Structure 1
């Protein structure tokens, strides 16, 4: 099967899909669309939004997938990364929901003409961001393993590390000297996943 991930030049919503595939060891073609070329590409995409995933068979079948975390979860479910039990399933999802809350705090800073961007960053770094980082810390503390849930990689590991990269985009020292469970989590994750470690070292710094 040929797997094509279609997104813009960045981490953004596609990141959970790429990391899932990378961690799973699944090869894919990583297609980035420029903002200039997007007007002509948009009509060729079912739903006209990105990220979109196009999966092609060696027998001519073509499957289109949209909705990033639905794709990530389906892929994660395929490669045993959503929990081995109901309880682990719950905990994966708990950490994902918490990580997404924080992502939505990060979203508030986008499409902002600066100045009010800065005024928002302050609002959130002084408000909900620390609250959420702490809740995430507690979610990690309650694990029986080195990682988010047990000792094996799950989608929760991947979604977490992408969201932290967004926090550090707003304030690079925000986690320095604090939240030891999150630093340690990243450390354990990269140790557990040489593929994800190499992938992370080959990005390709992007503004989002």
Structure 2
């Protein structure tokens, strides 16, 4: 039912794909590949702020990545049981959202800047974020980040870890609880399926992605790290 409008790549839409898959929800995708269809999309006025991601779900044309994620999380009970749990989930998700946010521009960076940005991301992961989540798991010694059950915070943390490992395969060295976490969460049926071949999970963005985005939107021609 849900239709995700975006480019054929990760970008800001990937986390939405992750959350939907984790909830075992099947979705379709509409890839923007030409300046024509985009302008036609702006014509219809279905993009409230003239921006994508855009997701058609339950009779709504939702824009704003966080709005879309929040709704999917709440609808499929992955947002906790009370306001207090939701506050923890939002706090944890805020950390990983910042971490993955540093890699959003990577594809558009020059071969030179990519090296600097890459070192930056790894530094942030191992010195700021990983320690923080490692401490949370140890503080309560539970299998999940909150409510002793799977939540959006778990899914978002698993995605961030895999993205960091794509840059440094041994990034989890020195964080045994997170390493166990990674294994456990990956084993969950819906997630295991998304990680398996033939899923709608997108691969690391390449030059074809960078070009398509630059043509359709006519922006990000000079992304600075």
TM-score, normalisation: structure 1: 0.82
Contact 1:99 1:136 in 2 (8 A): no
Task: Tell me the distance in 2 between the aligned counterparts of 1:183 and 1:7.
Answer: 32
Q: Please list every run of 5 or more consecutive structure 2 residues that lacks an aligned counterpart in the other structure.
A: 206-225
Aligned-pair RMSD on alpha carbons?
2.3
Contact 2:54 2:61 in 1 (8 A): yes
Which one of 176, 181, 189 corresponds to residue 194 of structure 1? Answer: 189
Q: Which has the higher contact order (CA 8 A, sep 6+)?
A: 2
Residue 173, structure 1, aligned to residue 141, structure 2: no
Cα offset, 1:96, TM superposition:
0.4
Cα offset, 1:184, TM superposition:
1.6
Residue 77, structure 1, aligned to residue 79, structure 2: no
Structure 1 match to 2:56 = 54
Task: Tell me the distance in 1 between the aligned counterparts of 2:105 and 2:55.
Answer: 26
Task: Tell me the distance in 2 between the aligned counterparts of 1:79 and 1:52.
Answer: 19
Q: Please list every run of 5 or more consecutive structure 1 residues that lacks an aligned counterpart in the other structure.
A: 57-61
Number of residues paired by the alignment?
196
TM-score, normalisation: structure 2: 0.76
Task: Tell me the distance in 1 between the aligned counterparts of 2:113 and 2:106.
Answer: 8
Using a 3 Å threshold, how does the CA distance of structure 1 residues 52 and 152 change in structure 2: closer, same or farther?
same
Structure 2 match to 1:158 = 155
TM alignment of 1:1-208, pairs within 5 A? 2-33=1-32, 37-43=33-39, 44=41, 46=47, 47-55=49-57, 62-107=59-104, 109-126=106-123, 128-130=124-126, 131-143=128-140, 145-175=142-172, 177-191=173-187, 193-202=188-197, 203=199, 206-208=203-205
Single out whichever of 66-75 and 106-115 deviates more from structure 2: 106-115
Cα offset, 1:65, TM superposition:
0.7
Structure 2 match to 1:59 = none
